[PDB]
Symmetry: D2
Subunit: 224 residues, 4 copies
């Protein structure tokens, strides 16, 4: 049951960051998981959560000590964040998250990766990709709301790596995850970071997280 879970993975996996389980967060989660929630509502709530999620994830970056001088002509000591970053959406669901990134980071560069599992073989292949030219030089915020089998995010990381990105500079921004998924990611790429809002029980006979949220891209974009 729930509490065990978070305890184990939080314990076993030091690079995942779970968002504070506030009442609001649960409240939001409650609406988005409800199979009865109408489309307009699902996207309103998803977007909100998502913004919180990114603000959370943003803390994962390197920063500057910075001293400022206030209007009172007095000194203040802050921080300044300096890394070159960019967002990389996993098509199609991760796209739903680009909006929020763009909301807090205006004009961020946005890479895209469409990955698909063979209809027969089940193997995940890189179908299409469009990424910044110097991505090898920046911190990447990988976006995909779901991590069931870790099948998809793993292929994505793989390709980013072949492009020259450092494993430690990738920030996997997820909304919901299964333990399996979390383990695989760390198994293959222990140096990445993962921020998430929820970890569920397990995967369905069908490979669907449970109790879960269903097909996210479907409920978000309205193609269900």
């Amino acid at each position: 049951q729930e509490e065990s879970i978070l305890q184990d993975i939080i314990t076993r996996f030091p690079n995942v960051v779970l968002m504070k389980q506030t009442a609001q967060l649960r409240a939001m989660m409650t609406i988005i998981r409800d199979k009865e929630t109408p489309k307009e509502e699902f996207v309103f709530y998803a977007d909100r959560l998502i913004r919180l999620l990114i603000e959370e994830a943003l803390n994962e970056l390197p920063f500057q000590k910075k001293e400022v001088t206030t209007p009172l002509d007095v000194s203040y000591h802050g921080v300044s964040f300096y890394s070159k970053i960019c967002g990389v959406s996993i098509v199609r669901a991760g796209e739903s998250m680009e909006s929020g990134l763009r909301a807090v980071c205006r004009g961020v560069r946005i890479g895209k990766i469409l990955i698909q599992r063979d209809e027969t073989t089940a193997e995940p292949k890189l179908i299409y990709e469009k990424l910044p030219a110097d991505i090898r030089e920046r911190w990447v915020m990988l976006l995909d709301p779901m991590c069931a089998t870790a099948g998809s995010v793993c292929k994505a990381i793989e390709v980013l790596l072949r492009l020259g990105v450092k494993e430690e500079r990738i920030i996997f921004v997820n909304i919901l995850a299964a333990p399996q998924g979390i383990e695989r990611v760390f198994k293959e790429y222990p140096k990445v970071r993962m921020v998430t809002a929820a970890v569920d029980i397990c995967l369905n006979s069908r490979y669907y997280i449970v109790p879960g949220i269903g097909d996210f891209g479907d409920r978000y974009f309205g193609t269900m």
Copy 2:
């Protein structure tokens, strides 16, 4: 010069609707076309322009007529749009306009179509598509910022039609066009509606619109 072309198209193509050429619109247009514009300014201004464009476009739908009684307790005669719609973006460039549609139309279903020209052969092939199941019964707001040779959009309409959408129900939303694209669209699919913001002079050697904007998707997403 331009007024001619404008005239010619306005005359020869009854289904196109060029938008109001205001000094505001041109001012936006000048910012977005400038090679010197920074990604942030570029996205802000395109976003704004896009909003205006979607507003224009939505006027292309069928609407009822409606009497309402006001707080002053006197009836009022207005209209109501009663059709079932959805937006269909042409990946990737058409994606920048999804935000705008969602902004005026909360929770409108978003279909996606990825068309790509064979790298040897030059032709359009449908690569990926994820659309609404009842699309055959809806009004399609097709999104694609640019219309140079009309290759993409044309392949996009074909697929839509094989699914069952009514040709006269497709509303091709565009920012910038080149006369021949318009021409081609219309030779092949005469019953579609097209709303756009600018019509440019000619295409270039590279099939780039001129004086144009450059590569829209690259400038909007930052994979410059």
Copy 3:
């Protein structure tokens, strides 16, 4: 009656610009005028309309001509707005419009003016005001969704003029007017410009425009 009324204003006051009467514009108005409209919807649509209305009025500002060079190394000739502006809202209903204004012109300075119709008489009286320092030198986007008697706005212009604002530099943005309010404004301040989206028939003994919208401020902020 409407047309005849619209045209007459139009022919009668060269300085008033009347928003384009699109079916969408009417759809929007019908929902906001409907007595039966829920508060969340009313704000949604009101905001929707405000954005278009604001975009319209911005066309009344001055501009230079600018030729830029496209990414395709070819010149484009557009224009640019060089102009120090600011919005001034009339508390409290006009505050519902500053959002729209801040949405299109980032960090635009905003002044506020609170006027109160005296209880004995009803002579408008200035309760409070906080405006830019250098306002004498700016174009003013004066904000007030309703213009019944024009008592509030005329008083507002009065003070603006007292501070040094040039009359011809005031752009009065509004959503709904009564012919009677229009006449007073231009009779008193012939040199200002006024952009509206609708003109209604009469005013009541309670000074409510009819068929009208009811109390805007209460409807928008939810204080019925």
Copy 4:
């Protein structure tokens, strides 16, 4: 020293909730604090912060327990919120927060109150107010970014109280407070909750918090 002050506030007033001092939060405050920051920049960050702050405050509301069933047919146990709420802004600075509140609570009723400290002396006097009439029955998101002497928020509290709002039903949303201010709020109305994002060191002869931000109202509204 901050810690000290911070922890000491924390240990002393069971009822205040400080926002988690993330590096992000400090980066934001750093920008908005620098005298050197530009108008549009100040507003962008101030707004970004405010939204986080509001999400924080919303967790002070009461919630039910709720169970729904997932699209996969397995139940989930969430927690519904369900109370009549509303925001009340202290003009003019607090109105800078209504947007934030309106962003997450669609069409939330907004009340406004404007208070002036009488020159001569210094007792704030109520200048104007417009509130829901349903208010004695609601939870109130009282908004005011700076809390120096606390003279204003206490006066607002005083009128809300007079109107019949239950003291323990008032959530005071703040950005920067001064201990002295916090102290007066609790000595006068201890049953209230206060959510802030920062606690500075001292108030000065002209009553400005230090290191502080300067005048919030005019920096955000640009009337400085």
